[PDB]
Amino acid sequence: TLWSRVTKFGSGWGFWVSPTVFITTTHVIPTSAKEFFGEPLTSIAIHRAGEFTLFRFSKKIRPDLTGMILEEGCPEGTVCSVLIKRDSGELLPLAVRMGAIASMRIQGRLVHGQSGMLLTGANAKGMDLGTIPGDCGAPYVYKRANDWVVCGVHAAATKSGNTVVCAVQASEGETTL
Amino acid sequence: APPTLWSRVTKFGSGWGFWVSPTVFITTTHVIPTSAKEFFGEPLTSIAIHRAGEFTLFRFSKKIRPDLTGMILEEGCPEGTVCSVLIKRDSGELLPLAVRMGAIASMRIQGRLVHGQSGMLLTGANAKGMDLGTIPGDCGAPYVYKRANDWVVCGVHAAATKSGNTVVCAVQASEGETTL
Ligand SMILES: *[C@@H](CC(=O)O)[C@H](CCC(N)=O)NC(=O)[C@H](CC(C)C)NC(=O)[C@H](CCC(N)=O)NC(=O)[C@H](Cc1ccccc1)NC(=O)[C@H](CCC(=O)O)NC(C)=O
Ligand SMILES: *[C@@H](CC(=O)O)[C@H](CCC(N)=O)NC(=O)[C@H](CC(C)C)NC(=O)[C@H](CCC(N)=O)NC(=O)[C@H](Cc1ccccc1)NC(=O)[C@H](CCC(=O)O)NC(C)=O
């Protein structure tokens, strides 16, 4: 059911944490939008923290979903899965061994995130073994005990290596877009 | 993966099969329909069957999939190769599951002798489940990888551990039976 939460959004994707909470990477958000999912901006509580943006709606947009745990990154060494959905209809889950949470500057943008190494390896070639432009917003998830946890959204990666970066939520964040 | 590559993955018996070329179809022996009189409209007497354990190749005498080019089929791949298992599910989902291949070996699975290659799924910490790993119904799915500018198929899905993190694809062998 995890895949059902990954939604196409703007130039990337977003993830439904619950019926009222949607997270995504700031960069991919549709520009000058008057509303989202039929809901007027004034009825949405937007939390924009750098490259991590969270939308909290007044009503249930995805009432078919249960509420998941959202945390600010994960312990270093955790092996997560980045749930990459493609317009081709392909669902591409990729294991990533997470590194440290750190402030970063990626192509002119300040990114509070966590780097990770794709298990497909540095020698891995092909879009089916790594992330590519258009994949931002994809969720980084993992299971702790009996609970599923989402700890970030895809923000960047090296062009020829196996290093990726997911933006992570922060306490401070703007209220507008 | 390219749309034409996915188009080669075909529902077959209790699983799937893969069109290597317009005249060659491969699958896992276990999923082959029982008591079949023909395949794709061709009577058995017109098909050259090569059944090598859990790997079966069908060669037809007319182009069944003329829209396709011929691909390279090899007996497994080098240990360490990262392949993608082209999994199709009944609801239209396409899941190219990454797998780091291990060694080729003669295995004994549920009493069956399976000449195959094991591999570690690279989808998550525990590929247990339908969203991250393989499940019953997926046998026959091709294990492929790109070498330079050529897509190569090196096996067909045959098994997985209970946790689901380790998988096995049946691989072709030079010797095989000519019957079902
Ligand atoms: C999603 C948004 C979009 O499509 O615009 C997209 C996903 C890219 C991917 N390949 O998964 N993100 C980007 O494109 C992002 C910009 C947005 C606005 C945040 N840029 C990157 O991810 C670029 C690669 C773009 C591309 N053509 O694929 N990556 C970097 O700049 C990378 C950042 C990084 C990655 C891992 C760890 C730390 C930092 N930096 C490098 O590749 C550097 C560049 C040279 C340098 O300054 O050192 N090179 C090396 C070897 O690290
Ligand atoms: C496709 C055909 C079908 O649907 O019947 C299907 C795909 C399974 C999947 N989940 O991807 N294949 C099978 O079901 C296949 C049929 C055999 C080849 C006749 N069997 C298995 O995949 C079983 C499923 C066990 C289960 N989940 O209950 N897997 C094994 O038997 C597994 C094979 C293996 C894989 C990797 C490395 C080594 C061995 N073996 C085990 O789990 C063994 C069994 C020991 C025993 O039989 O007593 N146990 C351990 C701990 O390794």
UniProtKB/Swiss-Prot annotation, chain B:
Reactions performed catalytically: Endopeptidase with a preference for cleavage when the P1 position is occupied by Glu-|-Xaa and the P1' position is occupied by Gly-|-Yaa
UniProt domain Peptidase C37: residue ranges: 1-180
Domain of life where this protein originates: Viruses
Residues at the active site: H30, E54, C139
Role summary: Processes the polyprotein. 3CLpro-RdRp is first released by autocleavage, then all other proteins are cleaved. May cleave polyadenylate-binding protein thereby inhibiting cellular translation.
Assembly behavior: Homodimer. Monomer; in solution.
Protein name per the record: 3C-like protease
Organism: Southampton virus (strain GI/Human/United Kingdom/Southampton/1991) (SHV)
Residues of the full protein shown: 1100 to 1279 of 1788
